[PDB]
RNA sequence: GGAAAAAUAAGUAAACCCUACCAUUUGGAACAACAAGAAGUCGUAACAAGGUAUCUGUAGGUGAACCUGCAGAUGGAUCAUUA
RNA sequence: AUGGCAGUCACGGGUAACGGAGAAUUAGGGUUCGAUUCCGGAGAAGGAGCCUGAGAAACGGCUACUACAACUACGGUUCGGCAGCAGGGAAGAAAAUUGGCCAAUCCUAAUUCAGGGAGCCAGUGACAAGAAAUAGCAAGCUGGGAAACUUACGUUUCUACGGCAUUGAAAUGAGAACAGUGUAAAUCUCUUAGCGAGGAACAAUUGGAGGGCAAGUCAUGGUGCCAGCAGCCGCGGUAAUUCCAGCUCCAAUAGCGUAUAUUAAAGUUGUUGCAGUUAAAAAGCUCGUAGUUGAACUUCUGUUCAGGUUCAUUUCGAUUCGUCGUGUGAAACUGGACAUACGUUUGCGUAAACAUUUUACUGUGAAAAAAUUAGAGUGUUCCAGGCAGGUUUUAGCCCGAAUACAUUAGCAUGGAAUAAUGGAAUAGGACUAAGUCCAUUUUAUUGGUUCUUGGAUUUGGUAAUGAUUAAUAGGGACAGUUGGGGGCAUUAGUAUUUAAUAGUCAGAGGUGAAAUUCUUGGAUUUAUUAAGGACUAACUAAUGCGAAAGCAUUUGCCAAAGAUGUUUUCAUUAAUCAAGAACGAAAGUUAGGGGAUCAAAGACGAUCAGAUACCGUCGUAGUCUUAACUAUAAACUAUACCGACUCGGGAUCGGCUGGAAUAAAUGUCCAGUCGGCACCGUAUGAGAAAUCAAAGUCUUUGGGUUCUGGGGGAAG
């Protein structure tokens, strides 16, 4: 299952959403207060996902959308703090670059060359998606040098 | 990679009938799978069945007795004009005397027989006998 | 699985795949490239020729005899051909340099029985049949 | 005024040469196989632990099979011994 | 100006290729042919060019050339062009008469009456098709059956049927003819006088008797592996079921052998429908574009009415050789109707306009070439077949020349499923009101105002304002781990080899024995150091990691990874994959290094008949390393990848979750569970088996996708 690992890649990491869609009974935070916290965290430069984690561990908010009705990114969009490049792609490029970095120096490292090939492969593969779905500028390309200056 | 939910559910079904099992949990499920079951039940093969709402796709428990000799899907879902019916009933079914080839039509999902009585045809789904 | 596409847009790949694999079938291959036309008969059913040699041919194991034969120069081809002469003392009905009518042995390009490698038989001598001559209906 | 011959300019362009190719056949110096068979010659590589276990890749040697180097496979002659 | 076409195969080859209508086979799906009656197209020996016409690049017209045909008094000439008919030559395995007519069918023309090698008629004609003789009935003698009787054999009958180198006359065509039919005439047929049947004639063959394959259980003759048979297996070498013959018998039968292409046989081309662990077959391994393939959710549903269409029958009936009527309920419809519910608005159940995103798909319909094919009607004496026929109501009558099929693409129209695609996420999106522009048909005409209308735009108001889940799909985040995954640095450890410094001495080596070697210049041997290249023992396993190749000393650094844990985030982002790319043992190659061990080549010893081998002593390239190439292995589970589902049991490696003991922890044990590597039982699952928990869920044959195989060699 796990993408681009043929043969044995296949296993199940967890998350399982409970049945109750209604937010929990012990929870006393107004959806507005939540949107406030999430936006504060956001302006502090966090990720929609990282925000999710923070709200869940510290703040007793299990699922933000079942509280608000808006998923975390949509909230970020309306309220204007927006993560210009999708967190998703962002990390993939950060990675491909860390591999670039390490690889320019150790030029005899073959595994990392192959790993790079894989990661860049995924990057393009995500680009197509975010492009056809209008989440990325249409002429936007990942190159070594272009993407290195691209906010990553 | 899941293609054709009808195929999953149908094969798992036949397997459990073949193993002499008394019931089947079936997942995940579609309209088509439920209409296909409503069809086999209406036609006498399976018994009562229950649908389970997990918030996502769904699960379905099927009481079977044992009747089904085989119940298959045909993929791809070919095009079956009224002219071609003869072919498919001779090729797929055990005998003229029984068994059905189910089809999607613009008039809905039908026993091939229901199709002669409705005078239509064209998309083959599966069969059971 | 099955290693073969099933899908309704899969049509050309299917048909092309066959248009390829079909080549492994021998009769198809031999048919499709001219093979017939290049053979000593030039695709034909029989042929006329001249007799170069009367030749004995020792039979394949485990048989011993002397198969009576002839080497013929086909008049259409000018190719040289090794042909068998059937039944008994029919090699006598043949003179060197006659007109002779020659056909396949029934394996379509291959030799039969104990005669090794010889793919053809004699049918007519001058104008007449070997059968006609054998049974002594006519005379040469 | 009409108008035949004859001439004129440009075009259509057959045919014949020269250059360079493609197709279908074909002549040919010089090379030159393969499959089948068995009462020729030298030896015995392989089938049994074929008498050095075979076999694959590669490389070198060499009347002939073949031999030797390195890495590999049991289709092995081992499904197996911490005390 | 720089376009146009191309992996959805351009461009270019090949065709013993003119395209169709169609033909042969056909369970279905297919396969294979169509030079040839009809329709297109092309050409008239090869090219080109023209005249004239309404039409021509004509070719039974002309001009030229190339290549040819006919006359010539040599100078000239041809109404010289068989892929028209007939006929020659040639090629070939292969294909008819130098005939008669316009009577029919039609065509042409100044035209009823003329012409026509179109066409028809005859000849040749085992291309091919249809029907069909080569003998029938009895007698007498019989075989036999059967009864009965007779207790054992005799008799009487012959729904059995047979058999006769015997008797009997009848029957009739092949043949042949007067006549009559038919024809343009001639022939043939058809109708018919006078004729025309008892046996080697009025006589059937062609292939076969071992199996496949119907037919010899010949004490048959010849031949003796010869001659020959035999599609294949095989028969023949002195007793041939297989050759040569005789007898007999079999199979097709006016036909029957043989050769070759093609069809079924063939599930041995596979869509239906095949195979790929070992029979031929999964690509060494990953990434990936074209291509193919894609999770679930939306007017579910209920109630009432009617129309049929089916069903059942303890409802009945009527008649009859089975339909009809009727029940009553029961169905799937079809269509009304109300339910937040397949639409407005207008004119007489049907049109339009408006609105409904497009299509694939499916149901109808139009448009549709005859002959074919399927098929109705019809006794061409049957039949092939033809399109005719049937009737004394006769200066007539009755009836036919159907219908289906007519695939693809266009066209019209009905459609709800399924599949794709759409729509309001920077929204003036939608409805509505009020403004502003740009156009604007009509008001017989131009001008201003307007009106309408139809586009754009600004702003208020109305509405529930508009974002389906969240796949035991996938990407991402994060947290504690885990690993002999990778790259750099570091670092150890004995070991081999060598050297140094000490010792001691005569032998070390090596072998089946030995000999080459080394040795007093002191080897082997002993102790301590040092140099130099490799290599990571033991722990080390049915254990781990890596895409595969492959990866095992310490520590540090660098980037990377799975699994698990998540009430984190994204929201179909995925599967497989021609192109195109990254790797890829060993050996090998190029340019430098390095060189301890082994060690191809080589040098030697031995062994041996010979050893250019196995054994021994040496030894170069190599082995190691930088940069580069190379791309291959039994690169092996000889087993493609993603996804389901089908048995049981312990154990193992990595996470996690509880629980228990202790000496209280990076350790034990117990119970869960997720993911790995496997194993052991077992299958009423699979397979030719060996075997396989997949190699299972396959004639009860279809989850998605690449690849590969089609007897053996030739030959990688
Ligand atoms: Mg999974
Ligand atoms: Mg074949
Ligand atoms: Mg034959
Ligand atoms: Mg043989
Ligand atoms: Mg004879
Ligand atoms: Mg040339
Ligand atoms: Mg040989
Ligand atoms: Mg020999
Ligand atoms: Mg060599
Ligand atoms: Mg053709
Ligand atoms: Mg024509
Ligand atoms: Mg036309
Ligand atoms: Mg002619
Ligand atoms: Mg006339
Ligand atoms: Mg004729
Ligand atoms: Mg005939
Ligand atoms: Mg007469
Ligand atoms: Mg007679
Ligand atoms: Mg014979
Ligand atoms: Mg004899
Ligand atoms: Mg005989
Ligand atoms: Mg083998
Ligand atoms: Mg779907
Ligand atoms: Mg309504
Ligand atoms: Mg040292
Ligand atoms: Mg060292
Ligand atoms: Mg370990
Ligand atoms: Mg070197
Ligand atoms: Mg000796
Ligand atoms: Mg040595
Ligand atoms: Mg614990
Ligand atoms: Mg099989
Ligand atoms: Mg079995
Ligand atoms: Mg087992
Ligand atoms: Mg199959």
From Swiss-Prot, chain C:
Gene Ontology cellular component terms for the protein in this record: small ribosomal subunit
Keyword Cytoplasm attached: no
Keyword Endoplasmic reticulum in annotation: no
One Pfam family recorded for the sequence: Ribosom_S12_S23
GO molecular function, one term: structural constituent of ribosome
One GO biological process term: translation
Keyword terms of this UniProt record: Ribonucleoprotein, Ribosomal protein
PROSITE patterns xrefs: RIBOSOMAL_S12
The family this protein is said to belong to: Belongs to the universal ribosomal protein uS12 family.
Name of this protein: Small ribosomal subunit protein uS12
